[PDB]
Amino acid sequence: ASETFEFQAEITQLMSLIINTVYSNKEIFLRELISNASDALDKIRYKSLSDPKQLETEPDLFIRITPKPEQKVLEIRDSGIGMTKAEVINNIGTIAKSGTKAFMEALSAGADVSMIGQFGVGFYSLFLVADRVQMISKSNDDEQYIWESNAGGSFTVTLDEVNERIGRGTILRLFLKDDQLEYLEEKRIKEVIKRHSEFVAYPIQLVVTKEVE
Numbered sequence: 541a542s543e544t545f546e547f548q549a550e551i552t553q554l555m556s557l558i559i560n561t562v563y564s565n566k567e568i569f570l571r572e573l574i575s576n577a578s579d580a581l582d583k584i585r586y587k588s589l590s591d592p593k594q595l596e597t598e599p600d601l602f603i604r605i606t607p608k609p610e611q612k613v614l615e616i617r618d619s620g621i622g623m624t625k626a627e628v629i630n631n632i633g634t635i636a637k638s639g640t641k642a643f644m645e646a647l648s649a650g651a652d653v654s655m656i657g658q659f660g661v662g663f664y665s666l667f668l669v670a671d672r673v674q675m676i677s678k679s680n681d682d683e684q685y686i687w688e689s690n691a692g693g694s695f696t697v698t699l700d701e702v703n704e705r706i707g708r709g710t711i712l713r714l715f716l717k718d719d720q721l722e723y724l725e726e727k728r729i730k731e732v733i734k735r736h737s738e739f740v741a742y743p744i745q746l747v748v749t750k751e752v753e
C-alpha cells in the first residue's frame with residue numbers, strides 16, 4: 541500500500557517552474573544526479589571508517605547509468621548510503637528547503653538553471669528532462685522504498701515489492717519527456733559526463749545493450 545504526501549508549497553512552485561522551462565542547457569540534470577550519487581558514496585565511505593561492516597551489503601562503490609530505450613527511461617544508480625523511509629519523506633518534499641525560494645528569486649533575476657546545485661535543490665533538476673520520477677532507495681537501516689512524483693503537488697512512498705533488490709544505495713529512475721530522448725544514447729551520455737563530471741572519485745559505469753550479429 542502506498543502513502544501519499546503533499547509537497548511543501550515552495551517545492552511545488554519550484555517543480556512547476558522547472559517542468560515548465562524552455563531552458564536550453566538541460567543536460568546539467570546529469571551532473572546534479574552524479575554529484576548527489578558521489579555525495580551518497582562519500583557518506584557510506586566516511587561512515588564505514590568507524591564501522592566497516594556497513595559496506596558489506598554492497599562492497600563495490602560505483603555510479604551506474606542504464607538507459608532503457610524501450611521504456612523511455614534512464615536510471616542512475618549508486619551504491620551510496622541510501623535513505624530510510626523517514627529520510628525520504630522528510631528530506632525529499634514535506635519539509636521546507638534552505639534555498640528553494642532563493643533559487644527561484646535568482647532565476648527570476650537571470651540566474652542560469654545550472655546554479656541550482658549551489659542552492660542545495662539540484663535533485664529537482666531532473667524535471668528538466670523527466671515528467672515523472674521513481675526514486676528507489678535502500679539504506680542499511682531500513683527496507684527498500686519507492687518515492688514517486690509526476691511534479692504535481694504530492695508524491696507517494698511505497699514499500700518496494702516490484703523492483704530489483706538494491707544491496708544498498710539508490711536508483712533514480714527517470715521517465716524521459718518525448719523531446720529529451722537524446723539522454724538514452726551512449727554517445728550523448730558520455731559527452732555530458734566528460735563535460736560536467738570530469739572529477740569524480742568513483743567509477744562511472746554505463747550499461748549498454750546491443751544486438752549480436
Ligand SMILES: COC1=C2C[C@H](C)C[C@H](OC)[C@H](O)[C@@H](C)/C=C(\C)[C@H](OC(N)=O)[C@@H](OC)/C=C\C=C(/C)C(=O)NC(=CC1=O)C2=O
Pocket residue numbers: 575576577578579580583618620621622623627628631632660661662663664675710
Ligand atoms: C549534502 O547532502 C545533500 C542534500 C541533503 C540531503 C537531504 C542529504 C540526504 O539526507 C537524507 C542524504 O544524506 C544523502 C546521502 C542523499 C542524497 C545525496 C540523495 O541522492 C542519492 N544518490 O542518494 C539526494 O538525491 C535523491 C536526496 C535529495 C537531495 C535534495 C532534496 C537536493 O535537491 N540536493 C541535495 C544534495 C546533497 O548531496 C541535498 O538536499
